[model samples]
Each structure stands twice: as structure tokens, then as C-alpha cells.
Target: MLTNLVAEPFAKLEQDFGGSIGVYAMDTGSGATVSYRAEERFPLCSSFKGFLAAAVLARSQQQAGLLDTPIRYGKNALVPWSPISEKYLTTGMTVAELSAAAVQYSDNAAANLLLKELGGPAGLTAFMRSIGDTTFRLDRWQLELNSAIPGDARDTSSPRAVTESLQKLTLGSALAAPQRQQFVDWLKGNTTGNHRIRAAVPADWAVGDKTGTCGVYGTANDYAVVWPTGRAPIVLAVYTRAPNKDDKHSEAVIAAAARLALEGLGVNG
Candidate 1:
């Protein structure tokens, strides 16, 4: 019954926001669901890094210290969006560090390094399928994939798929308990897109999430597990694609969607 409470606001939000938008929210405790265009594909951008990280951790089942293996980065691999590698310029980073950088900062260079560590784009998508998310595609690395290709598809995922991925991670389906916890722990400190989905929520609430922005016109997205203090954490994924250069508009739309979801779930006032 409570699951339906989110429908009207979500519909209204989609109409007002315009462009392409998708949203999904699920209460981990009651199995209640709320969504809008959740099954339609949207550009994933850096948000795909979280799934890549999951794939890496999942593939590490036999190799004990796989996440600790170090790899070096150079100017040749440097991409404009990566603040992490630019700060280091040229330095070695462990697999875990690179993954953390990718998730925490949307570091493009770090994401590419990890993609290489996973043996390139094919390997990443293969692993995503192995985990039962066949709808999401991974065709290119960060910088290359950021641009919207004509006719050809950019990396894509529906809101439902992204939300389900987080739920699977939380339930220890895609990764072992330890690795899942480690991944979720890393997300707790995500530093990007705070102005988006996390903007309207109270500071006391806990949100662990990943943000993605791509294309000449910003395609902004955020997927998260929200812990509203005493309640079970809810998984929420919001995406927006617009024709504007700056992401501020798209970001606000995501925040409004998130705010609606959290409030409908009784997690926010």
C-alpha cells in the first residue's frame, strides 16, 4: 500500500523536469517499490564504474590480493575529467585505490586503469551479464564513452537495473559478504554529485552513492543506498539527460526526484 504513495509525485516530477529521466527507489525492508521510466535505457557515464568495481571484486574470488595489486598511470592515459591522476600526474596506484578513486571522485583515468586491470571493456560487460544484469551495456572506456555517439549506443542502463544492482550488492548476491561491504563502505564517502541527489536530504541521513556526468550536453545520474537513520536503507537511482552544457539543471532535477522518493518513504520531512 505504501509503495504506491510515490507514484503521483514521481509522475509530476517527470513532466516538470523534461528531457529523458528515470527513477527507481525500493525499501530494503518492506519490498516496497517506486519508479518512473525505470526500465528505459539511459546513458550510464561514470556510474558504470560502480558495476565495474563489483565485477573486479567478483572476479577476485580466487586471487587473494587482487584488489591490492598496483598499476602505474602516465600522461598518455591521462583524461581531462580525472582529478585524482592529475594530482599525482604520474604515479602507481593499487587496484583498490584506483577503484576508490573512480567511485569517490568519478576519476576517468582511475576508471580506465581498472578497466585495463579487468582486461578491457569486453571483460567488464561479460562480468555484468554473469551477475544477471544483461540490459546494461559496456562498449567503451570513460573518455571515449562520454560523448554521445550518433546511431551507435553509449553505455546504458535503466533505473531499475541500476537499483537492482545495488540491491544485489547489498544482499551479497553479486559479491561475497566482505567485498560487498567493502564496496558499500567505499561508496559512503562519495564526494561527487552531492549537489544532486544528496542536496535535499537531511545531513543526519546516510547516503552511499555513485554519480555520472557525460556528453557535450550533460547526462547527469546518481545511484545510492540511503540509510534514513533507524530505518532500513533504501536503494535509489536517478538519471537525467539534457541539452544544456552546464549540469546544474540536470543536477537539480535529480535532487528533486531523490527528495520525493525519500520523503514518500517517510525517511524525510
Candidate 2:
């Protein structure tokens, strides 16, 4: 098993980082998998924005011109870490623009606005279930969801579930063709995930990733679709969390774990 081969590497990486690490990597071409604590829950953090955008795209398929509707919000709507949405407060942003901000920039306000349109946490969870993913659950709004409290299940998901759902939304038929490509485009342009899964991949290979950091308890995660030229595409999720509140999550640990997962899958850079 790939997990058997890579278990020690993952354990070593997690030991050095002083936290638990969860990983799941799949070779879509061969249906091979690499798993380590993959079924265990980890805080979703901002990574949920990726799926939130997908939910919006799913809705767009049924509502013509929904992506172009301009949504205006007051200053109170602005939350911490809302770089993109704050800039467009006066003029408002289209549904598509907000979705892009949420996916590409991890814009806090943009995610909340789109989440509201989707009818909140349960609504997004329903969308996940519709796509055949039972392990995903979103229970709170942004900021609060980012808390990532220990033993708290709110806004948590397994690595295996994240990768499985991502594959469906991005490469599978969860969304219509145009909408799926749009989702991929948004992820490919993501700005905050360079240090995580992307770091483990060769520079020439194409990758689209989303990252999450909870700022406490060493809770952070990343999930991505990696395309190595002339070979099958790989989808993987890496997550880490520590026991203490003051612990810090390491980007290098994520990169290292990703490297191990890729190695387990026989993907050479």
C-alpha cells in the first residue's frame, strides 16, 4: 500500500512539526491512493472557500446571469482579512468577482457574502452531499469557522474527503463544463497557497491550490490538483494541527508531506 510505504515519512514530518498531519493523494489516472490519517477530521479554515465558490458555480448553472449580479454591502460587512472585498465596497462586486476573490485571494468578506447567498453553512454542506461527499460539513460563517478549536467539529473535514470532493468539482462532472473550468481558473490563480502543496511540485508542472491557516493550535491545511506534463494528474490534500494553542503550523511540513505523498505515488519531479 502507498500508505504503508510513506507512513514513516509522514510520521517523521509530523514529529518534527509537533502536530498531527493528515494526507491523501490520488492518481486519478490509475486510481491509486496514498493515505495517512486521511480519514481523521481537520479544521477547514479558509480552504472551505474553494468549495463555497463551487457551490456558487453550481447555483449559477440554474440561475441565468447570476454571476453578473452586482452585490453591494456596507462597511459592517467587511471582516478581518478582506483585502479584495474591502477595495470594492463602494462599487460592489459581481457574483463572479466575489467568487474569484474568495477562491483566489481567500477574501474573507467575499466568502461571507457568497455564503449568505448560498443560505449559510448547512446550505453549502447540502451542496457537498449532492456531489456524493458525506464527510464534509460546514457549520459556521467565516472568522468564527476559522477558530479551529480543538475537539470542535464545526467546519472540519477529512483529507480524503477534501481530495475526493475537489476531484469531482474540478475534473469530474459535479459542475457543468464552463463552470468547472471557471472553478479551476480561480484555483489556478490562487495567491495564498504557494508555500504549501505547490512548493512540493516542480515549478514547470501546473498546480492549483487553496490554503487555510487558523492562527492558533498549529491548525492549517492545503489541497491541490497537480498536473505533471506527460503523466496523469494528481490530487492531494495535506493538513496539520498541534495539541497546544500556542503551537504554530509549518508550511515546510506541508510541503514535505506533499513530497512524501507524491513519492508514494511514484511521481518524480
Candidate 3:
């Protein structure tokens, strides 16, 4: 019944935005869930960096000092939106720092660099499979993955799958204690997600999020692990895509959808 109340608003928002919207929100403590096209696949965009970081963390558990090791990349490694990596190109950066930049700034070069460390897109997808996530897939490199072609399945995952795996990596037993905390810290430090899910939650609530924008096809998404002070945390994913390739994605629609999901869970904004 609670989810039913939220469905109307979600459909209206999608219709008004001239696009498809997918959302999945869950109360970690009560296991209550809200779903709207949650199983439908949507382009991953930059959000996969969160998982890329997790994959790196998993590998670090086996290889010592991997995080602390500094990596020097040539100028060609730099890509648009690589704000952090570009600054540190001459100085080089540690694997840990690149991971942080990829998640926190959605740094493209940082993500591409880390992808090589993990053995490219297939390697990252393999890591997800190792964590019991079969739906999350990465088939291409950064910028390319952001294409968000209308019917292409590459570099896509369902909102439900994203929320589930995110909960696993951030709060479940997918990563070790220290690594899990590190992953949480990286997400908490994200600077690219203020307009999406973060905009809808109360300011005082502790929230960590990752956002994705394809810059075409009206595709963009955000997922977060939200702490509501006294209660258990909630995790949610909101993804959007429009029919027209040039249609602009709206951050306002994402915020609105996030608000509806929180309301469905009876969470005060």
C-alpha cells in the first residue's frame, strides 16, 4: 500500500519529463521496499565507478600496499571531467587516491586508469559476479559507457540491482571491515551528487551518494546510502532516460523522484 501511494507520483514525473524513470528504495532495518520499473535496465554512466572502487578494494585485500602505491600516467590518460587526476598527473597518484577521485569527483581519467588496474570492463563485471550480482555489467570504457544507446544492454543495470549490490558493498559482507569503511568514506565524500537524491533528503541526515550523467539520451542516475539518525539506513537508486537522444536530463526530476521514494518509506524529509 505504501509503494502504491508512491507509484502514481513516479509515473506522473516520468510522463512530465518525457522519459522513463526507474527507482528502488529499501529500508535496511525493516526490509521494506519501494519499486518503480526497478528491474528495467538503464545505462550505468559514471555510477559504475562506485563498484570499480569496490573491486579495487577487494583486490587490495589480496595484494598488499596496492592502495599506497603511486601510479604515474601520461598526459594522454587525461579525459574530459578528469578534474582530480589531471591536477595530479605530474605528481602521480596512489591507487587509493584515484579510487577516491573516481567516486568523489566522477573523474573519467581516474576511472579509466583504475579500470586497467582491474583488467578493464569485463574484470569489473566479474567482480560484481563474484559478489552475487549478475545484473550489473560493464562492457565498455568511460565516455563510451556514457553513450546510453536506446536499446543497448552494455554498461547497464536495473535500479533494483544497483540498490542491492550497493547495499552489499557498502553495508553487507562483500568487503572486509576496513575496506567497507573506506568505501563508505569515499562515497560520503562525493562532490558530484548534490542535485539528485541528496537534494531530497533532510540536510542533517548523513548521506553518501554517486551520480551518473550520460550528457545524451536524457540519461542520468544517482544512488545513495542514507542514514536517518536514530533508525536504520536506507539505500535507493534513481535512473532516468528519455526517448530523444538530445533531450536534456533534469536534475529536478531526479530530486522529485527521490522525494517520492523517501515519502513511500515514511521517511521525513
Candidate 4:
């Protein structure tokens, strides 16, 4: 399902923007799936925070009430685009709230804080491997890579890896029930990417998702599990890297791709 719907729009996106686009979607209800360049690596950006959240949520299970653990941070821990930076920079917050900000607002500082709490990229990578995800990499902190640095490598992931990770989360393999639900709740309330996957889907459908973007041209991505009313959930991951930094273009591509998937899959929006 949606095998043909993806190719046309994706091709147009690549031609219009002169960049690569990767798409992967699966209808968990009907056991149907499709992909375009799903194995190719793309810059992950903040989309990696979803995995970070999964790792932290899993760890919280081992410690009794660890999610409620209060964390304090100074101003130096702050980074640009952090929703928590302005208010919580000097003050402190809990692991749960930090995670909330990281997901809902894509708060960079909150993400970095959690990364530090989780023992950095190496630790996150180990957690990913434990879950059998080797295609995603968290090589640098969000703040450090906000700019172009000589010889600096950025975070990366393939559509298949992202879709697989989401599958794990939704299938109750990545996090415990309560934790997974909490993470999903955060994603459902996400304020970003309204113009991407969310734009094409019905407002009543349940959407748990994350969006990633860098200032550079040709980079916008969204990974989501869309639950349409009276139908099985659809796992959708659309990534685009074009020579244009215009957010509207990237978002339009994502939205169109999602709509095509829904229509072709016969899933009522």
C-alpha cells in the first residue's frame, strides 16, 4: 500500500529542490509497508531526541520513581532554541519535565541536559545497540553542532532505522507501558512540525511524532506514528534535504507524502 503514491511526490520534491528525499511508511494494521531510499543516511538533527527520550525512559524503569528526580542546571547549560533555557536556566527542573520540553518544544538545552544525564552520546549509542538499532548515530551534542565546524560530524539516521525505532516504541519493546505512554503523550502534544505530517492528517487522528531541522538548506524531517480513527496505526517517516532552506517547501513535501500514504492505504483521514 502507498508504494506508488510515494514515488511521484518524492521525485518531484527532489527535482524541485535538488536534494535527496527518503520515505518509509507501514500500515501496522494490514502488515503493508513501503519505502524510497529508506536505507540511505540523512542528517538527523533534533529527531534524535526521540531516541534519547526512549533511553531515559527505559532507565527510569530500573530506578524507583526516577522520572521524578529533580535536576538542577546553571545558565551555562543553556543553548539556543531551548524552550527551558529562558525560564529554567538558573532554576532547576525534573527529569520528566525536561523530557517533556525536549519532545514538545524540541528544546535543545533540555535535550543536552538529558543527554548529559544519560552519560552522553556513547551511552545513548549503547542503548540503541541494545535495542538492535545500528543505523542511527549520535556523534555530537546539539549545541556544539549548531554551526558548521571544520571536520565536525553530525547526527545521522536512515528512514528504515527511524521507522523501526518507532515500531519498537509503539509495539512496547523499547519502553515499558507507562513510560511509553508518557513519551507518546509528550509527542502527541508536540508543538513543532504542524506543517509536516500533521498538516495532511485529520485533526482527530492521534499523532505522536518528532521533527528535525538545521539552518542549512535541504534538511527537514519528521517521524511519526499516526493513528487514524477506526483504523490501524500507520508508521510514517519522511526525510528531505534540499538546497533550499525555505521551511515551507520541505514541510509541503512531508505533508504531501503523508496525504498520499493515507489516501493510497485506504485509511480514512
Better of 1 and 3 by TM-score: 3
lDDT of 2 by residue, 65-183 (tens): 99999999999999899999999999999999999999899999999999999999999999999999999999988888878788888899999999999999999999999999999
How far is each candidate from the true structure, as Cα RMSD in Å?
A: 2.3, 1.2, 1.3, 2.8
Query: For all candidates, what are the clash counts?
Result: 0, 0, 0, 2
Q: lDDT at 262 for candidate 4?
A: 68
lDDT of 4 by residue, 1-269 (tens): 33544334557656765677888888897777777778887777788888888888889889878789888887777767887656976668889898888888999888988998888988888898888888877878785543322223457778988998888886646788988888788888889979999998888888988998766656778999888888778898988765444533367877887776666566776
Q: Write the per-residue lDDT of candidate 1 for residues 164-235, one digit (tens) a residue.
A: 878898654778889888888888888996887778667888778899877545477899987777778789
Model 3, runs deviating above 4 Å: 1-8
Instruction: Give the poorly placed runs of model 4, Cα more than 4 Å off.
Output: 1-8, 146-154, 243-249
- Which stretches of model 1 miss by more than 4 angstroms? 1-6, 149-152, 243-249
Clashing pairs in model 4?
218-241, 218-242
The lDDT for every candidate, in the order shown, is 0.79, 0.92, 0.93, 0.78
Error of 1 at 139 (Å): 0.8
With candidate 3 superimposed using the best TM-score fit, by how many Å does residue 109's alpha carbon deviate from the native?
A: 0.8
